[PDB]
Amino acid sequence: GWAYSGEWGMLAGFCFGTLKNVQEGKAWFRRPYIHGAGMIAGYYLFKAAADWEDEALKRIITRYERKGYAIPEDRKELFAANQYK
Amino acid sequence: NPINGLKTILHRVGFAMRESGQALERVGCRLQGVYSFEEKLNRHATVLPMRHNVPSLDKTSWVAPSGMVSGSVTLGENSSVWYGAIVRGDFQPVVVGSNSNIQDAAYVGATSEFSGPVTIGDNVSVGHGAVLKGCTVGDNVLIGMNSIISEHAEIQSGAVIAAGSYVEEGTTVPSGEVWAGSPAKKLRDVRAGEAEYLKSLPGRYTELAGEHKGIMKVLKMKQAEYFA
Amino acid sequence: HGPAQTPTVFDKLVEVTVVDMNGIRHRVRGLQGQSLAQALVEYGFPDTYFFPNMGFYTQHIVDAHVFVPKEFWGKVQNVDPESDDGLAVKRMFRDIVQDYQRDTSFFASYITLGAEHNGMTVGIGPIKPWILHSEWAFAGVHDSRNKQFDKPTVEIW
Amino acid sequence: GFLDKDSVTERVLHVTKHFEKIDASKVSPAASFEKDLGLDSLDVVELVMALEEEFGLEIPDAEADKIASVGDAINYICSNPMAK
Amino acid sequence: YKPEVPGNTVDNWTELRASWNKERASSLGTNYYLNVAVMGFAYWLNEAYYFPPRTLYVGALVFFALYVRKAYFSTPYAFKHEY
Amino acid sequence: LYLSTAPKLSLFTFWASSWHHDFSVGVFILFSMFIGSIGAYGQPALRSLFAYSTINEIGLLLLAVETAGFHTLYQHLGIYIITQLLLWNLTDKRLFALCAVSLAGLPPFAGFFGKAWIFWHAMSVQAFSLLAAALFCTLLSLVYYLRVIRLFWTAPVHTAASFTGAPNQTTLTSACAVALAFAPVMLVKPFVI
Amino acid sequence: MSLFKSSLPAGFLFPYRHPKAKGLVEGTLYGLGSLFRGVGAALDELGSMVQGPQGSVKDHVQPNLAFAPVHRKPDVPVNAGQVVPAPPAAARTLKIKEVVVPNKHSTAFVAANANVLGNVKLGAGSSVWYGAVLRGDVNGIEVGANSNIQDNAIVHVSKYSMDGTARPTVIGNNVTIGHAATVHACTIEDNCLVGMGATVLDGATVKSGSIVAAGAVVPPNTTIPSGQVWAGSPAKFLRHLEPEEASFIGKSASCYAELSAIHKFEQSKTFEEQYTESCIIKDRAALADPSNSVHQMWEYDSQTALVARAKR
Amino acid sequence: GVSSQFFDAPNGPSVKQVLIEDEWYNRQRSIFPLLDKEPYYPVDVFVAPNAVVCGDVDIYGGASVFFGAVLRGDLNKIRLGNRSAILDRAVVHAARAVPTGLNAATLIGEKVTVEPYAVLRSCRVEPKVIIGARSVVCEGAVVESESILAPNSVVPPARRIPSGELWGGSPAKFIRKLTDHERDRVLDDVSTHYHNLATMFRREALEPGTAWRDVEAWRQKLVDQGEYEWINFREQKYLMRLQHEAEALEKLT
Ligand SMILES: C/C=C/C(=O)SCCNC(=O)CCNC(=O)[C@@H](O)C(C)(C)COP(=O)(O)OP(=O)(O)OC[C@H]1O[C@@H](n2cnc3c(N)ncnc32)[C@H](O)[C@@H]1OP(=O)(O)O
Ligand SMILES: CCCCCCCCCCCC(=O)SCCNC(=O)CCNC(=O)[C@H](O)C(C)(C)COP(=O)(O)O
Q1: What is the dihedral of CA G248, G249, G255, G259, to 10 degrees?
Q2: Are H206 and B22 in contact (CB under 8 A)?
Q3: What angle in degrees, to the nearest 10, is found between the helix axes of F26-42 and F128-152?
Q4: How is the beta sheet containing G109-110 ordered, strand by strand?
Q5: Nearest protein CA to atom 42 of ligand 1, as residue
Q6: Contact at 8 Å (CB) between H133 and H150?
Q7: Do chains G and D touch (3 or more CB pairs under 8 A)?
Q8: Residue B155: beta bridge partners?
Q9: After which residues is chain C broken (C to N over 2.5 A)?
Q10: Which atom of ligand 2 is found nearest the CA of D41?
Q11: N or C: less crowded end of chain B, CB within 10 Å?
């Protein structure tokens, strides 16, 4: 999957904490433990999404080859790869 | 000012550590089954810093517990802030000289958007309930009770402002003159027998502040007997 | 400018006699430039008398069904029946009033109190059950002591 | 002003006409119940009940007690927002 | 400057009041009749998907041209005592 | 909130799993899209606005069903369900504008991606007339989502505090669902297939 | 005796502080809580150190200045307050033998944030309101029965003046002192009214049944006779009293007696009562749902949210 | 005389009443109800720790109550508009009735600033108004929108200040007309400036803080000595109501 998905998840967690503060009338830096928990959850959620990227590509190539669609070996590496793009 | 940048970074990091610690202590209280942290007691602070701006109080100055000073406040030698008085320097700073008194429930501050700093000189009597917004007060001046001094007004040395008066914005009051009225105007010159009482006024307040500071120390020891 | 009179609230006061749906006459004081629905709300009438103005971008305005005598028919503000405000009034007549409608039927937010309304007598008209959302409705019976004035907000959502 | 000042007046005269203790020609559009027509309180209550029957209203005791004239009754019906 | 409202206030307000002095029906009849119409007669359009596109487009424009709007609908038959 | 999310998911999964018919649903696509868009344009009450906009969205989901390609159906349904979870639990009214820009299909937010794979697969199998009707109704939907933005974004902010405890009790879920501005990085990839 | 007076758990009866733990699980939780409290206070102190000089200012409770002493002076006679013996800690530390505390009648109301200090006498049914300053330090302050000093009003006396006269402040019965009024070394007779924001200076006399208007400044050594209204800066004669204003003065005094009762009722509740009341407010809002599953079996007391009786 | 016990309070009668001279620390709440009249406020309000907001008070939006100010809604209602500032030790009160016959509640519009030591009682202040310092606006008076009152001014009861003007004096007279830029921008500027200062105070507040640790230490010492009393407050309130009902029944017959 994508190489920078965990950093994107951490930025998502920071924005999550800032919005939870803004909704309840607090300044952006208040309750930094909420930011930290949000960062951890965002990191692991977007890493799981990046794992599903590779899983979906593997499922597509496996189903297509079992149906009779013969893919050349120069193009099978586009699918059967845990590519860290 | 990059010095203020380093101070800002340190103050924000320490604040985050303080929030985390107080929250963990409240979780510990909940685990113990004790809910004293939920008490809605009075959270008034006599000294109130504004981030890294701490009031600078002399060791011989006194602020009454119902009084308050906030932000960049300088109190000189033997100067007093009495009961209910509010001296605010969180926007623009406040500078108070030596042997000057801010009497009970008086407001001295520089919080307007275009106000300069407040500068109060030496041996200054600020009366009860007077409102001072962004002004400069010279040495040996009585500010009368429930009076208003506006922004950029200059109360020069030896002048008397009578009770209930309102000095307009940017108004210079000359030396040794008495001014009165809501459109405040010169009434007369200060007389000599008047000036004797003007000279003898701030020392009484100095000794009264000493007596009240001692009684407040007695009250604090009485309070400390309960929990210690 | 000279020795002319200081402005008093009594110069801008408008008095309207209002007859509620029980027939009880009430003395209602308002100020010039204030609408009639606002003066009715501030007098202390119950919340079952009021309903949203059913236009777009104006459901935060409370409104009431009033009966206006023929002398004061020409002092209600004019509404184009082809405009969007006209369709708002048509929706209110279609849904809220229905067969309580008379030839004296108006809506109280379309009456702006001035000196020409001084001494005018109006009556509160009945309305059908309605709903805007779960937190603002009317079941059909005027049995509630809750004033409209005591509501802190008027909620469109 | 909720209703006109002519048809209500002739309806008032029409229901005042059928009273046995009243004179069918002495009744004027602006008279009095006490000095002119010679009625006590119960006759006034009976006349107000007849007016209520004709116009389909409900007039309380204090309001009907304030009504002392033909013009007073006409003005009360005209000022009423629930008249028929 | 503000534009003047066209017309007269009494005449405009009588136009606003018109055809609404009537109790509104419940919506259950409209909903039940719509469901009956769809569940009984929408199978008549099954072969219509294969018809030529000029016919389908003209039929859609014809349905749009003959449509009567449900909101602000009124009939003169609501206030007459005989046909 | 319960009625707009769970039964649609259950029934569309039954449709994906075990259903074939030899017919079409195109007239109901046209009816849903045009009726929902015009109704939400014309109804001033907000509950009726959201009911008619829901009819428009189910017309788009039916366009995804009719042209096959259930991957675009599932992507749009998931984005819609997350928006619904944000919509019915809002206490701060400024986030009502984020629901508006993400239900109008405006580009950087996730509703654009959910609409745009439906449009892409419809254009792939050449369902031109239903696609043109969908594009016209998408142009109409923007007007009342802008009405939503006018109502709740260009207004002074007031949010009442809690008094009997439970202080703003669903800020976690609403603030988590507002981060549908970060899901588009995963949506552009071949993800839902 | 609600319905379950002998079966409710101790946490429900004492929400402010749970009783002593007994079993293994509760003691383990208590020990974890003490560890969490220690680590949390340590992290708070470390964060205050990292923060800088602003962290040295700590959170402390404030003294009760509603009933506060002053120095007993030998030249100042004590006629309003009372001379009480000093605490032994004060005596052994900073040489105090006698202090002066106020004389406060049991029916008077003082706000918890007011400042009443020293040589002050408070009459029966009288009231001092939020933020008021009554500093009797160099002379005496007397407040009569059923008199009110309203919010942010300042009362002070003089020992040394311009003309060398020590003047107390005496306030009579049924006197209303307006919002943010300044009362300084002067005499207010019975059944008078001082307007809100007004100023009465040194040695001025307000005779009985008179009114000082709002914003007025009473110059020193001015006598306002009975049945007159004075206004302006400086205050001159304006009007005679109306027939209705004299009864309005008594109405104002009675109204503040009724108000001081309610405010004293709310103010003098303990922390444990306030926390129990917050838990009751929470239960009442949970019971306001008509679909609550307990509504079909139990009937709840309105004021305490306890089960009163079985409904069915 | 009036008793200080209320058996028809919403949460019941007070079981234990503490005399004020027996208090060893300051317990003044800043926001508290008076029987059945509870204040209403938003999530982003600034209430200063030594300010008092009691009774029937409605606060909206970004309003702020600064140091030592009092908003006492015990005789009527008080409403504070969106982004309206009550500065240091100003008093807002309300009468039960006004001579004009209108509603006697004090209604303050949005974007209204009230300078230090000013008093508002049963008055109507329309949006975008600057009330000067040491100013009094009396019962039933009306201050119209986009107007300014000079410091140390008295507005007598049932008087009016016209819109778009600057008024001042005791009694208040005409000074000058505001410029169009003053009505367009300056009033909103003053309100926004004071809201920004209130936000600066709101960011740095640690609530509830740590001052409770000492009081809890004293209570822990009392539990150590065995002198801490556990009071069943709900049951005591119930029993007090039952005794009150029995005492009321045992005197009519
Ligand atoms: C919270 C507790 C509240 C209480 O119970 S009482 C405490 C607060 N009450 C008050 O506000 C007391 C003051 N109220 C009044 O105004 C009153 O008592 C004040 C009585 C003399 C007079 O108020 P009125 O509403 O009776 O006003 P008048 O008819 O007497 O005014 C006559 C005159 O005096 C002037 N006047 C009136 N009132 C005042 C004032 N105040 N200041 C200066 N000048 C004034 C005014 O200019 C008038 O002249 P013009 O306006 O030029 O025609
Ligand atoms: C279904 C039928 C059942 C009916 C049963 C009910 C019958 C009740 C009848 C008994 C009630 C009475 O007589 S009550 C007794 C009435 N008599 C008195 O009170 C003595 C004083 N005389 C009057 O009041 C006169 O009415 C008058 C002088 C005209 C005063 O003139 P006005 O009037 O201008 O006031």
Answers
A1: 140
A2: yes
A3: 20
A4: G109-110, G127-128, G148-149, G176-177, G193-194, G211-212, G228-231, G236-240
A5: G214
A6: no
A7: no
A8: B137, B173
A9: none
A10: 34
A11: N
